[PDB]
From a paper:
The glucagon-like peptide-1 (GLP-1) receptor is a class B GPCR and activation by GLP-1 leads to intracellular signalling mediated primarily by the G protein Gαs and subsequent increase of cAMP production. It is well established that activation of GLP-1R in pancreatic beta cells results in glucose-dependent potentiation of insulin secretion and a subsequent decrease of the blood-glucose level. The signature of class B GPCRs is a ~15 kDa N-terminal extracellular domain (ECD) essential for binding to the C-terminal part of the cognate peptide hormones. Accordingly, the two-domain ligand binding model suggests that the N-terminal part of the peptide hormones engage the TM and ECL region of the receptor leading to activation and signal transduction.
The structure was determined by molecular replacement and refined to a resolution of 2.0 Å. The two complexes in the asymmetric unit are almost identical, except for the most C-terminal part of GLP-1R ECD (Ser136-Ile147) which is described in more details below. The Glu138-Phe143 α-helix was observed in only one of the two complexes in the asymmetric unit and its B-factors were high compared to the critical epitope of the ECD, suggesting that it was not tightly bound to the Fab and maybe not relevant at all. The TM1 α-helix of GLP-1R may extend out of the membrane at least until Pro137, in a manner similar to the glucagon receptor. Trp33* is a key residue of the GLP-1R epitope and its hydrophobic binding site is defined by Tyr51, Leu94, Phe96 and Tyr108 (CDR2 VH, CDR3 VL and CDR3 VH). Val36* is also very central in the hydrophobic Fab-receptor interface and interacts with Ala101, Phe103 and Tyr108 (CDR3 VH). Phe28 of GLP-1 is critical for binding of GLP-1 to GLP-1R and interacts with Leu32*, Thr35*, Val36* and Trp39*. To our knowledge this is the most extensive overlap described of a Class B GPCR antibody and peptide agonist. Nevertheless it seems that the Fab-bound conformations of GCGR and GLP-1R are different; GCGR adopts an elongated conformation whereas GLP-1R adopts a tilted or closed conformation.
Numbering used by the authors:
A (entry chain B): 1 to 224
B (entry chain G): 29 to 128, 136 to 145
C (entry chain A): 1 to 214
Write the structure that this text describes.
């Protein structure tokens, strides 16, 4: 049972250095195999970056010209990715992988993968979200169900967690993926469908948490 | 310079060269020779009946300089069969001279 | 410098149906073609290596074929846990290169969206901007037209959509469209409407409000 798992900072400022660690368990990285870094861009471009062999020999994608180094610490069974002077084009999910091979047909393939670690490159400052109610114009409707929500706006970095009535309300909930706005800040909505008869008899509160700014906000959603 | 990938490339090249030999080398002196073959480890030539057949340590091996004079051996019986135990489905082979187990286990995983 | 192309970047199929994902290399890669599955949560698994060899532990529903420049991955019967993105990878020559991926999702019967519109809250308006939100709930297929109209005038450049991942239980999607205007622009107009066009709707559905009635 080989396991690989990446660790490192999730956030880095432009022009800084990026350093990631892959911690390998269940197999010695100084034996037999090669040990690779691969990253996945948003938009599904998957790019091979390089490997370090069991012997310490490395080989890098030419595109990552001078910026990349791969190293290992054999006593701790870890290997490392250093990427110089990152820019926002280095925003990606970074994976470490073991390569093995078959000497029956000469194939070489990545048989075990880490879970990946997301990296965001950005100079934006930490900021908690504003939380606004999403409520129908009219508080009286003839339809059987109604939708309520809250708009979670202008925060950084990801993520926020949104819950409804402190976790008691879960069915009918959709919390949308955050969108990066022109400003460098993220925004999302969370919505819930409920029976129309429940309005004004039952209270609906969205609980928003943003750990990076130590924000914890409750917003009661009612039709004005 | 030393990697699983480099060794794989060398194995592929070894295979390509062996395949050329299998196809292009002239027929044996007589009718009875043991037939040439690639066993995924080494290229075996046609074998003379009644003779041991000697093949240099395959050059793609990572330790292929620990053993520069070394040979791996088969035997071709008087009947033109590669020597093979009743107990086995592969021909007898002695590669003791070309040994370096983790890399070697992988080398023989089919 | 080998380009891997998966011409189809998105595919939807019914539970139980046969699925084929295709890959093309810019030059002959001599069967050194590997297939990987990336689940929605990001986990990546090797499925197939050397065109057709099944990695141990991988369901036998997966098979691979091809030669030269053209390769294919096949799922003999689609099951829910196969919802994932599938990537090919040539392992013939450095640098290793991957295809652009094919996202596989479940095809279900048509379901029309339930549509809701929300005005900007008074709390937001005192901050200087106005967000108008249109929600499309629990629909299928994903394809939908969402148009914003302000005093019956069509809007461009000032809205963003977000879509949920396909729902694991009922296979539907939900979608939000957010129209962003300055406070001043918002106050300059009266009628705000979002119009939705979708396979499950015989004719487009419009939801609207008058700014004054909020």
């Amino acid at each position: 049972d080989v396991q690989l798992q990446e660790s490192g900072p999730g956030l880095v400022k432009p022009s800084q250095s990026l350093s990631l660690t892959c911690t390998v368990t269940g197999y010695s990285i100084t034996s037999t195999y090669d040990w690779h870094w691969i990253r996945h861009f948003p938009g599904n471009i998957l790019e091979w970056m390089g490997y370090i062999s069991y012997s310490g020999s490395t080989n890098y994608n030419p595109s990552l010209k001078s910026r990349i180094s791969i190293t290992h610490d054999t006593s701790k069974n870890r290997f490392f990715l250093k990427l110089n002077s990152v820019t926002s084009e280095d925003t990606a999910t970074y994976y470490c992988a073991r390569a093995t091979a078959s000497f029956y047909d000469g194939s070489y393939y990545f048989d075990y993968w880490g879970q990946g670690t997301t990296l965001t490159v950005s100079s934006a400052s930490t900021k908690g979200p504003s939380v606004f109610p999403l409520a129908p114009c009219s508080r009286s409707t003839s339809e059987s169900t109604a939708a309520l929500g809250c708009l979670v706006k202008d925060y950084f970095p990801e993520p926020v967690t949104v819950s409804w009535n402190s976790g008691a309300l879960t069915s009918g909930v959709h919390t949308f993926p955050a969108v990066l706005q022109s400003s460098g800040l993220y925004s999302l909505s969370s919505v819930v469908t409920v029976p129309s008869s429940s309005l004004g008899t039952k209270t609906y509160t969205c609980n928003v948490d943003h750990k990076p700014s130590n924000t914890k906000v409750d917003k009661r959603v009612e039709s004005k | 310079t030393v990697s699983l990938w480099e060794t794989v490339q060398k194995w592929r090249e070894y295979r390509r060269q062996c395949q050329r030999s299998l196809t292009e080398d002239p027929p044996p002196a007589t009718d009875l020779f043991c037939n040439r073959t690639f066993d995924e480890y080494a290229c075996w030539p046609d074998g003379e009946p009644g003779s041991f057949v000697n093949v240099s340590c395959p050059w793609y091996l990572p330790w292929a300089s620990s053993v520069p004079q070394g040979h791996v051996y088969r035997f071709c019986t008087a009947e033109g069969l590669w020597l093979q135990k009743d107990n086995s489905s592969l021909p007898w082979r002695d590669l003791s001279e070309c040994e370096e187990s983790p890399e070697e286990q992988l080398l023989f995983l089919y | 410098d080998i380009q891997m192309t998966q011409t189809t970047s998105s595919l939807s199929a019914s539970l139980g149906d046969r699925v084929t994902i295709s890959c093309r290399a810019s030059q002959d890669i001599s069967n050194y073609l590997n297939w990987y599955q990336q689940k929605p949560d990001g986990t990546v698994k090797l499925l197939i290596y050397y065109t057709s060899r099944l990695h141990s532990g991988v369901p036998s529903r997966f098979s691979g074929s091809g030669s030269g420049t053209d390769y294919s991955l096949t799922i003999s019967s689609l099951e829910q846990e196969d919802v994932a993105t599938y990537f090919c990878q040539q392992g013939n020559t450095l640098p290793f290169t991957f295809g652009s991926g094919t996202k596989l999702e479940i095809k279900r019967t048509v379901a029309a969206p339930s549509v809701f519109i929300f005005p900007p809250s008074d709390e937001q308006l005192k901050s200087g901007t106005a967000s108008v939100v249109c929600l499309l709930n629990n629909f299928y297929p994903r394809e939908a037209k969402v148009q914003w109209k302000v005093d019956n005038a069509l809007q461009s450049g000032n809205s963003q959509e977000s879509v949920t991942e396909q729902d694991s239980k009922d296979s539907t999607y939900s979608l939000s469209s957010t129209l962003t205007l300055s406070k001043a622009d918002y106050e300059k107009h009266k009628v705000y409407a979002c119009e939705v066009t979708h396979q499950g709707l015989s004719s487009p559905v419009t939801k609207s409000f008058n700014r004054g009635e909020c």
